[PDB]
Design an enzyme around this catalytic site. Structure first.
Site, PDB file in Angstrom:
ATOM      1  N   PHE A   1       0.850  -1.207   0.000  1.00 24.84           N
ATOM      2  CA  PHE A   1       0.000   0.000   0.000  1.00 24.84           C
ATOM      3  C   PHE A   1       0.869   1.233   0.000  1.00 24.84           C
ATOM      4  O   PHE A   1       2.089   1.164   0.159  1.00 24.84           O
ATOM      5  CB  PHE A   1      -0.889  -0.018   1.243  1.00 24.84           C
TER       6      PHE A   1
ATOM      7  N   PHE B   1       2.532   3.877   2.038  1.00 25.50           N
ATOM      8  CA  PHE B   1       3.779   3.417   1.454  1.00 25.50           C
ATOM      9  C   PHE B   1       4.426   2.351   2.326  1.00 25.50           C
ATOM     10  O   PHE B   1       5.195   2.637   3.242  1.00 25.50           O
ATOM     11  CB  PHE B   1       4.715   4.630   1.261  1.00 25.50           C
TER      12      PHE B   1
HETATM   13 CU1  CUA Z   1       4.895   1.312  -3.898  1.00 24.67          CU
HETATM   14 CU2  CUA Z   1       6.551   2.564  -5.314  1.00 24.67          CU
END
Ligand code: CUA
Ligand SMILES: [Zn+2]
Length: 122
Positions: free
Chosen positions: A40, A42
């Protein structure tokens, strides 16, 4: 072929195999573990992924937001992670240690620092 192919990106975080991260690693065979990974922005869930050396690991990876990459450093594990789709990669880790997971699909401003960890136990 195989099992997971299509999933619902809008409910992936609250219903189904990726909804509860405590349950991400599921033994699916005498020497086999399935690991439900969410990529996802981050990061990766779970983090860390903990698995035993010598067991076949079946990674099942999807995204709740945008396209990501799932690459495990030091290995041939390199797959695209699409929202609404399940990416399945099979791997047997035969050396204990810490592996880093990196995203190689630009996914927004946090792309650079989007990392995960797999710990392979002895
Ligand atoms: Cu997740 Cu680049
Ligand atoms: Zn690499």
């Amino acid at each position: 072929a195989g099992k997971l192919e299509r999933v619902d990106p809008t409910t992936v975080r609250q219903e189904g195999p990726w909804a509860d991260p405590a349950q991400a690693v599921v033994q699916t065979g005498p020497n086999q573990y399935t690991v439900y990974v969410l990529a996802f922005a981050f990061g990766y869930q779970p983090n860390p992924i903990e698995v035993p050396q010598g067991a076949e690991i079946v990674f099942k990876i999807t995204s709740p937001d945008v396209i990501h990459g799932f690459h495990v450093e030091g290995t041939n594990i390199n797959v695209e992670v699409l929202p609404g789709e399940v990416s399945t990669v099979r791997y047997t880790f035969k050396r204990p240690g810490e592996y880093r997971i990196i995203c190689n699909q630009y996914c927004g401003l946090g792309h650079q620092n989007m990392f995960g960890t797999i710990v392979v136990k002895e």
